[PDB]
Design a protein around this nucleic acid. Structure first.
Ligand SMILES: [Mg+2]
Ligand SMILES: [Mg+2]
Ligand SMILES: [Mg+2]
Ligand SMILES: [Mg+2]
Ligand SMILES: [Mg+2]
Ligand SMILES: [Mg+2]
Ligand SMILES: [Mg+2]
Ligand SMILES: [Mg+2]
Ligand SMILES: [Mg+2]
Ligand SMILES: [Mg+2]
Ligand SMILES: [Mg+2]
Ligand SMILES: [Mg+2]
Ligand SMILES: [Mg+2]
Ligand SMILES: [Mg+2]
Ligand SMILES: [Mg+2]
Ligand SMILES: [Mg+2]
Ligand SMILES: [Mg+2]
Ligand SMILES: [Mg+2]
Ligand SMILES: [Mg+2]
Ligand SMILES: [Mg+2]
Ligand SMILES: [Mg+2]
Ligand SMILES: [Mg+2]
Ligand SMILES: [Mg+2]
Ligand SMILES: [Mg+2]
Ligand SMILES: [Mg+2]
Ligand SMILES: [Mg+2]
Ligand SMILES: [Mg+2]
Ligand SMILES: [Mg+2]
Ligand SMILES: [Mg+2]
Ligand SMILES: [Mg+2]
Ligand SMILES: [Mg+2]
Ligand SMILES: [Mg+2]
Lengths: 94, 71, 57, 127, 142, 117
RNA sequence: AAAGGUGAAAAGAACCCCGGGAGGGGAGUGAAAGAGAACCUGAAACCGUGGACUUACAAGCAGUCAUGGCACCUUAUGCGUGUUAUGGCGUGCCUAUUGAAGCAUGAGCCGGCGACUUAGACCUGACGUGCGAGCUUAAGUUGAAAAACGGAGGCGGAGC
RNA sequence: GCGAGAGCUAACUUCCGUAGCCGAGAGGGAAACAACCCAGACCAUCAGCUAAGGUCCCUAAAUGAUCGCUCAGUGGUUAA
RNA sequence: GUAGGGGAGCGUUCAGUCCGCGGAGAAGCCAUACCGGAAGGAGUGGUGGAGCCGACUGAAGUGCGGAUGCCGGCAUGAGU
């Protein structure tokens, strides 16, 4: 159920933020499974045929974080800001 | 108030010290030295302790003014 | 010679030191006659009554 | 209401059960020591306990409990036979600094702490 | 995201230490105690099972060790560092060998200490915890 | 013209002291110790970001090892037969399967072993 | 040496209350007494009252990061906020150094003051500009809620 | 570390040469540990493969497989 | 990434100028989970009582944790 690195595990019908997928307010993106999000269970190429669909939900500048670094005795103190851009996705699994 | 200054026609000075940003500590000067010192006089022809090229060399001739001719 | 303290002490310890300095409350009773309040085994100070009268009102 | 100014116009501050020993010549912590026994107790109790606590700061403290009871009964129309010590505390005054000479040439700043002793009396009922 | 569980159960067993090397039973039990065999395993919870050891009297120690195996208990006091052979401690009070072993094999912070308690140590074939219905664990490497 | 600090310093300082809370003693209350405490705190934040990336990985791992062993498999052998049948699952997911989804872990096991021999 | 501030105006608080007092609680004045004469704001260290969550088998540069608990809901019901238990992890800062947690220097804490500047119509460069084989004034003069005049000298022009 | 000198084929020794490293270098390893072995950190991730180095428990990972050795706790500090 | 050179900027005052606010309330202060890559800067709520934000440009006594720094206040040691 993977998507730009991270695998995921969905049941049916939910949100999941991933990263900068293309399109805007309501495209229609689809991915090929590695695993059954529930019943009977099947895995791998035996389950790529079984796939999921998932409609877009939103574009996102996530929660703030800072990037600070320090090394003693040098005066090395670094201060930067950072937000990781994500996309919100509605699960519509086959 | 309309106006504006020519791009690059006024450079903002250097105020040394002030942060690690920045020119931390020292102020360009490094660590110790005779150079480190709030004090005049060094100066510019003072090589070494020593004796200088400047005074190591033959004094040739003298100095006459003369009539110099306009081209 | 001349021992001093090494480091300033904290609000925390310091107030753990004080943990006992807490005053104990005079355990009092009301004095069968004049009716103020007497200390057990002493004279009820208002009237002067230990069983009849002594020090005076 | 609307304006802060309007609220200022309309209401006024009433202080219910409160009185203040200001600028009293005694160190905070000492005086607290008396006062820790008054707090939250049947206000008359406080008048009694404060007759048999043998510390020096018994008396200014009691003086302020009659003031409170006074202000509470009169100025605030309260109920003597159910009045009590809702609050009690003390904080620092402007502490009074003078020099003491010492061995050899040295000198010393010796501080005569003052106290803002303060009690708030109130009505205590369970239901 | 990942699944942090809730500590129901409280599960009990009987390790029979009769004729087993110390270190081995030591790690078997240390592990059952720590919890590591619980796929819902969790590092700030003491999920682990309760271990009842019988016959700590009849443990196996490989020679010549019990005539070589020192135990050093320092006492604060000069000339404290007292000694004890493994056979000494074994005839004396054997559950304090087994205890001693299992206890080096469990974390030395607030947790581990507290975990110690999940150890019930005996000798012969008798325990008073028949009310805790312990599941007779075995001796394997799985 | 002269320009006192006037205001700026109190500003900087408060900034720190508002970062600086929950901190035990002086740390949360005096500037210098505060800002300071935060220098070190910086070190700990950075490293521990990547670090937690390690730690979680560890956690997932031990849970899977468990799982395997719960039947008769080693972690290494399970995961290897789950590389062999090419069942390219994240291991975070594998933990999830393992501890929240029983019979599924069962099957994935039987698979790995099959592909192993 | 440090010393400054009630209010628009003294209208400066008659008068009742606890106390010898000091001080306060009313009242009354005022727009405000959240200005009452220790009288503009009232930061921080620092001392206290109350409340939340916690803390008496525990080993600690006091943080971090992960999870559970409990609490709260005015940029705030989720990426939450406060607090906490358990875990992993973790050698204050500065300066000085071959090398600092260092048992090496400095410092009790918090405020506020505290240090790379100015001058010369000097030198030499980078950016820019205006005129450009040409470029330029100084002292002064006059006017001056403004500036203009001022070639005396300066720099370029040819080297050896 | 390799080359030599002064030393006592002493030194966390000193004076040259030479490579790398720290200095000005975090990250994993060597329990701990400027120099050593792996490796040069532009931010984010609850994603995957490896290096040195590891895989009984503490502490991630084979209490692995087969042919052996030592029984001395050698391993876990020296010699004629 | 240390000494160092370079690049772009954040904030403070005074000043010229414009946008403009303010007793239905200015600055300053106090709380907070918003925004900016960072210096920083906004929203609202409580304080206060008469002044001030913003843009562009100019000039600086222009940004402090250290100097056994200076002034002042308040802590420790101690109810000793
Ligand atoms: Mg360090
Ligand atoms: Mg610079
Ligand atoms: Mg220096
Ligand atoms: Mg030097
Ligand atoms: Mg009125
Ligand atoms: Mg004398
Ligand atoms: Mg990694
Ligand atoms: Mg009076
Ligand atoms: Mg409390
Ligand atoms: Mg214990
Ligand atoms: Mg406890
Ligand atoms: Mg410094
Ligand atoms: Mg030295
Ligand atoms: Mg020390
Ligand atoms: Mg020191
Ligand atoms: Mg020295
Ligand atoms: Mg030019
Ligand atoms: Mg030397
Ligand atoms: Mg150096
Ligand atoms: Mg390193
Ligand atoms: Mg290292
Ligand atoms: Mg290490
Ligand atoms: Mg070394
Ligand atoms: Mg290898
Ligand atoms: Mg393991
Ligand atoms: Mg202006
Ligand atoms: Mg102003
Ligand atoms: Mg200072
Ligand atoms: Mg000293
Ligand atoms: Mg005493
Ligand atoms: Mg003493
Ligand atoms: Mg004594």
């Amino acid at each position: 159920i993977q998507t730009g690195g991270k695998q995921y595990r969905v049941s049916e019908g939910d949100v999941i933020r991933v990263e900068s997928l293309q399109g805007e307010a309501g495209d229609k993106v689809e991915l090929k499974a590695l695993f059954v999000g529930g019943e009977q269970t099947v895995f791998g190429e035996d389950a790529g045929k079984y796939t999921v669909q998932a409609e877009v939900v939103e574009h996102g500048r996530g929660k703030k974080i800072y990037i600070r670094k320090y090394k003693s005795g040098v005066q090395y103190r670094r201060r930067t800001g950072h937000r990781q851009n994500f996309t919100a996705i509605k699960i519509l699994g086959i | 108030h309309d106006l504006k200054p020519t791009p690059g026609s006024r450079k903002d000075r250097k105020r040394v010290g002030r942060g690690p940003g920045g020119t931390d500590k020292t102020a360009g000067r490094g660590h110790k030295g005779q150079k480190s010192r709030s004090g005049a006089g060094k100066g510019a022809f003072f090589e070494g302790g020593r004796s200088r090229l400047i005074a190591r060399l033959p004094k040739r001739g003298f100095n006459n003014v003369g009539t110099t001719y306009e081209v | 010679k001349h021992p001093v303290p090494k480091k300033k002490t904290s609000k925390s310890k310091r107030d753990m030191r004080r943990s006992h300095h807490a005053l104990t409350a005079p355990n009092l009773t009301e004095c069968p006659q004049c009716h103020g309040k007497k200390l057990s085994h002493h004279i009820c100070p208002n009237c002067g009554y230990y069983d009849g009268r002594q020090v005076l009102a | 209401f609307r304006n802060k100014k309007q609220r200022k116009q309309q209401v006024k501050l009433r202080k219910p059960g409160f009185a203040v020993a200001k600028y009293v010549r005694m160190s905070p912590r000492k005086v607290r020591l008396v006062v820790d026994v008054i707090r939250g107790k049947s206000v008359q109790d406080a008048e009694d306990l404060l007759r048999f606590i043998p510390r020096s700061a018994s008396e200014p403290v009691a003086k302020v409990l009659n003031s409170a009871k006074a202000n509470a009964l009169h100025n605030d129309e309260m109920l003597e036979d159910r009045l009590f010590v809702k609050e009690a505390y003390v904080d620092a005054g402007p502490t009074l600094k003078r020099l003491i000479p010492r061995a050899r040439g040295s000198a010393n700043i010796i501080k005569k702490r003052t106290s803002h002793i303060t009690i708030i009396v109130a009505e205590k009922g369970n239901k | 995201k990942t699944y942090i569980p809730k500590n129901d159960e409280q599960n009990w067993v009987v390790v029979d230490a009769s004729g087993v090397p110390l270190g081995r039973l030591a790690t078997l039990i240390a592990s059952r105690i720590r919890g590591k065999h619980r796929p819902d395993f969790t590092p700030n919870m003491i999920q682990g099972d309760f271990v009842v050891v019988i016959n700590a009297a009849q443990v196996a120690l490989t020679g010549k060790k019990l005539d070589d195996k020192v135990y050093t208990r320092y006492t604060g006091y000069q000339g404290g560092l007292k000694t004890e052979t493994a056979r000494e401690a074994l005839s004396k009070h054997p559950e304090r060998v087994i205890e001693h072993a299992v206890f080096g094999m469990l974390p030395k912070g607030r947790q581990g200490r507290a975990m110690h308690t999940r150890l019930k140590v005996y000798a012969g074939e008798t325990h008073p915890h028949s009310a805790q219905k312990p599941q007779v664990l075995k001796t394997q490497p799985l | 013209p002269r320009a006192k600090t006037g205001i700026v310093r109190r500003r900087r300082h408060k900034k720190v002291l508002k970062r600086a809370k929950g901190f035990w003693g002086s740390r949360s209350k005096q500037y210098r110790n505060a800002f300071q405490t935060l220098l070190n705190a910086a070190t700990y934040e950075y490293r521990d970001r990547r670090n937690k990336k390690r730690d979680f990985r560890r956690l997932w791992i031990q849970r899977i090892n468990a799982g395997a062993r719960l039947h008769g498999m080693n972690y290494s052998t399970f995961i290897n037969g789950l590389k062999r049948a090419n069942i390219d699952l994240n291991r975070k997911v594998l933990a999830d399967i393992a501890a929240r989804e029983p019979e599924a872990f069962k099957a994935l096991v039987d698979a790995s072993r099959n592909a192993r021999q």
